[PDB]
Amino acid sequence: REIHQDWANREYIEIITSSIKKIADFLNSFDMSCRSRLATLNEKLTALERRIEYIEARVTKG
Amino acid sequence: GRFESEDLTSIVELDGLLEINRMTHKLLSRYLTLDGFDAMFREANHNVSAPYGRITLHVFWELNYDFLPNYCYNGSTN
Numbered sequence: 001r002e003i004h005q006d007w008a009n010r011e012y013i014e015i016i017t018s019s020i021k022k023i024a025d026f027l028n029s030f031d032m033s034c035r036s037r038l039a040t041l042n043e044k045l046t047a048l049e050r051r052i053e054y055i056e057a058r059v060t061k062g
Numbered sequence: 063g064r065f066e067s068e069d070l071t072s073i074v075e076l077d078g079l080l081e082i083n084r085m086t087h088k089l090l091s092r093y094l095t096l097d098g099f100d101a102m103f104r105e106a107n108h109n110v111s112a113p114y115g116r117i118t119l120h121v122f123w124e125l126n127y128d129f130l131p132n133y134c135y136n137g138s139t140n
Contacts, residue, residue, distance in 0.1 A: 043095055044095075047097075050097060054101055054104070057110060058110050058111070060111075062113060
């Protein structure tokens with residue numbers, strides 16, 4: 001009967017939509033995690049840049 | 063600057079204030095990143111790029127002008 005076929009087809013849609021939602025949720029979480037790791041990496045990089053500049057000024061002659 | 067605007071007896075005050083600043087830097091470094099206290103102190107004392115800082119210059123200036131011709135020694139009490 002058509003009703004049973006419709007139920008099966010809608011089940012196919014439901015699982016596919018859930019898969020799509022899971023991918024999007026992971027994508028958002030991955031973006032947040034990488035950005036946090038990126039931010040802390042920048043914090044160390046700028047600190048190193050300041051420290052090397054201070055060392056160069058301390059050692060530069062003239 | 064506050065030390066530079068007073069006599070040689072403000073050395074104790076400068077050391078105490080410097081200790082407070084160092085401790086504050088240590089407390090802030092717990093959650094933030096900051097340059098070492100020694101580098102900042104040298105930056106404020108103009109000692110990073112020069113052999114001598116401001117504190118020593120003021121001490122020499124005070125000795126020449128005020129301390130030497132306005133103080134009497136007592137060897138019993140040093």
